[PDB]
Amino acid sequence: PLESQYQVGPLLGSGGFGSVYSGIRVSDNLPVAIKHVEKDRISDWGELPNGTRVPMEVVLLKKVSSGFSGVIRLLDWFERPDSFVLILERPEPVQDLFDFITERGALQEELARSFFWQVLEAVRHCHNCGVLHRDIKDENILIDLNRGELKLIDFGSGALLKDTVYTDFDGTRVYSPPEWIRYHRYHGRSAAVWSLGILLYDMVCGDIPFEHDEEIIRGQVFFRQRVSSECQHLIRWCLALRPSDRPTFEEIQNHPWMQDVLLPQETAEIHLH
Numbered sequence: 386p387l388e389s390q391y392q393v394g395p396l397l398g399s400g401g402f403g404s405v406y407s408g409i410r411v412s413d414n415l416p417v418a419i420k421h422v423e424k425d426r427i428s429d430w431g432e433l434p435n436g437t438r439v440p441m442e443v444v445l446l447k448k449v450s451s452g453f454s455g456v457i458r459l460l461d462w463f464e465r466p467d468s469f470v471l472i473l474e475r476p477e478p479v480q481d482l483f484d485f486i487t488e489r490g491a492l493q494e495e496l497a498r499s500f501f502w503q504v505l506e507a508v509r510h511c512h513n514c515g516v517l518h519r520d521i522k523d524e525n526i527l528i529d530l531n532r533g534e535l536k537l538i539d540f541g542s543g544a545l546l547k548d549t550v551y552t553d554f555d556g557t558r559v560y561s562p563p564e565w566i567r568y569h570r571y572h573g574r575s576a577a578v579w580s581l582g583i584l585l586y587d588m589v590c591g592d593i594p595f596e597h598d599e600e601i602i603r604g605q606v607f608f609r610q611r612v613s614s615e616c617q618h619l620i621r622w623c624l625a626l627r628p629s630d631r632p633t634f635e636e637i638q639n640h641p642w643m644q645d646v647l648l649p650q651e652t653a654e655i656h657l658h
């Protein structure tokens with residue numbers, strides 16, 4: 386069964402990660418998103434416990450699926466002759482960080498702190514499940530406007546977490562660390578901190594710091610907006626050229642700027658309602 390239980394609707398996103406349609410589960414009228422991936426486009430394949438070989442995106446999502454609402458929930462998947470169809474939970478109302486920032490420009494530090502903290506918590510979840518997202522950017526973050534909860538979406542470029550070096554990378558370039566641009570090698574957690582550093586800067590300045598590879602490998606951070614003397618520190622720390630000089634997830638959340646974060650609902654009332 387496939388066409389029988391879901392009611393396909395409009396086209397949401399597209400389309401290098403695949404095509405996402407807005408759908409609803411006929412079973413309970415639950416809002417869902419239906420994502421299609423063409424088999425020809427799939428680069429990473431992973432085996433399941435059933436031995437059956439599926440897209441890596443499915444394996445990752447299955448590992449990070451649970452009661453935690455910080456990462457998107459994979460509800461079900463189907464195989465088709467030429468494509469795979471992923472059923473994912475859909476927030477409503479919902480808007481991705483990119484549009485949210487594009488509308489409202491630079492977020493104020495109180496809001497940026499609430500969001501960034503949630504992202505940190507979500508990414509920590511993936512690592513604890515052996516998953517590395519590898520494409521952490523504003524576009525891949527959803528905002529549950531009512532609950533003030535951010536959801537991490539799209540593991541199409543992700544991979545199983547390992548402590549050995551990564552030599553492949555298919556995520557966003559402007560978010561990728563210098564050691565990828567300059568050596569095509571990196572370690573998961575180190576690189577993830579760099580991307581979060583871009584994300585944090587993107588929230589507080591309304592845009593990303595680095596445009597070209599030259600700016601990335603140099604790693605000099607200029608602030609175009611008034612940013613707290615302390616947020617700048619954390620931002621420059623995540624963007625430390627030397628990966629070892631970068632914070633750990635423990636260090637980032639212990640960083641002083643990250644203290645006294647709003648609860649999700651508070652954030653929604655103060656900044657979203």
Ligand SMILES: Nc1nccc(-c2ccc3noc(-c4ccc(Cl)cc4)c3c2)n1
Nearest residue numbers: 397398402405418473474475476538539
């Ligand atoms: N590309 C991708 N990969 C994994 C999950 C999703 C996903 C899942 C649920 C969603 N609900 O809403 C959206 C959405 C809404 C508006 C825009 Cl402009 C973009 C995405 C989802 C995306 N998309």
